Symmetry: C2
Subunit: 246 residues, 2 copies
């Protein structure tokens, strides 16, 4: 494949990933952007994965990795069938044709718009995993700045950016660009209550996800990755029962 | 196009070509290289463009830009038809399937090898234009350092890879490009970062363009100069058109100067 694809493949296998992502970010500064929500053509499309349960919808914010999107939430939603409805909010710019946000704030406004519409005045819960946790958080505070108070925010294995599968150039430059958007991220408070879930087992050779100011902070079995696949039933039930209380 | 392709075209239209070349060099470091002229597989192939004139063939080194390769010397070669033989030495790594030289010395050894093999002891002249002249020059020193003696060296519009001449020059180039060619462009740019005019035994003809390529607000120059030049002549045209519409005058100047040295 493309020279950008080969570079990313070889950089992960050779410890040069942080270098590859920085290069992708500069390539991404050559990409068409959108400066206002009104430029997208259509608002960010929300992708339902499990419906038919009533109650608030869980809006699951995709992460900022390359193979991010609805697959992150497939097993989480399958386990939540009947109990809670899962809809995914993709990150604009990972798919061909889509422009990148000119900055974080244009993106969150477009996202705030798309969500509030999709939810036709009903209570909804915001959810994210690793980078999607930062994205769900930034979007929750921007929603709160608008007075739209999300019912609750579920942050799953969130870390601070400044202190931590076939793919294509759009996804890879989208990741480079979204990394740049998140460099400044800081854990500003939210009125919406925060359920923090952190992995129970490290993912390779204290390393835990930490979030101060959380309403509940519970460990769940598995690794940074497997908590959302193999142990998604356990992660699901944790969120499901914890929502039944707040 | 790929994201590098769109990068490079958005870059020239927006005066960001220099930043894009740098990006591309960085990406190029992730590409397979050859570390010694035997890792290469097949040595650099030489493309004849005009044959039948006898005498030392003009070995024209390709430059390092997007559209570099044999097309640079089409008009030059057509105009020397039946006066000088012209044969192009492409730069390894611009075509799909070719790896990049681990360093400039690896490339020059490999090139020296291929040129000496092609020529078979028959005298040859090295020629180059723009960055191809730096390459033609550096190859002259490597061949001379090995006892080989190029009968002469011609530098057309040599500049030192020291900044807006490049941004202007890379503008007026704007023709199919791809990741391999683009990443090669980034890599060879990095290769010639520390190029400098070491002395040559061979006599040097220095042609420089008559008209500027773009606006230089400092009229106090933009010209291509070379110190060491046996002869230094101005030819009509700009950086680019001295090799196209004005190529016959370039050709004739070269042809005449080779009879007198």
């Amino acid at each position: 494949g493309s020279a950008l694809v080969e570079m990313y493949r070889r950089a992960v296998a050779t410890g040069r990933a942080a270098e590859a992502v920085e290069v992708l970010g500069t390539v991404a500064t050559f990409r068409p952007v959108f400066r206002s929500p009104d430029e997208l053509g259509e608002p960010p499309a929300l992708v339902p994965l499990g419906t038919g349960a009533g109650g608030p919808t869980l809006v699951c914010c995709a992460g900022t990795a390359a193979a991010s999107g609805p697959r992150e939430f497939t097993a989480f939603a399958a386990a939540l069938a009947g109990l809670r409805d899962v809809t995914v909010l993709p990150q604009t710019g990972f798919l061909t044709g889509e422009p990148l946000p000119a900055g974080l704030d244009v993106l969150l406004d477009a996202q705030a718009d798309a969500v509030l519409a999709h939810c036709a005045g009903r209570p909804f819960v915001l959810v994210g995993h690793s980078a999607g946790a930062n994205m769900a958080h930034a979007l929750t505070v921007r929603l709160e700045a608008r007075g739209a108070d999300p019912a609750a925010l579920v942050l799953m294995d969130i870390y601070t950016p400044a202190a931590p599968v076939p793919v294509d150039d759009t996804r890879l430059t989208a990741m480079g660009a979204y990394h740049r958007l998140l460099l400044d991220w800081a854990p500003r408070p939210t009125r919406a209550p925060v359920l923090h879930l952190y992995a129970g087992e490290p993912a390779g050779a204290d390393w835990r996800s930490r979030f101060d100011g959380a309403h509940t902070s519970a460990e769940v079995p598995g690794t940074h990755f497997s908590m959302m696949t193999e142990h998604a039933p356990v992660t699901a039930a944790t969120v499901h029962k914890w929502l039944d209380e707040v």
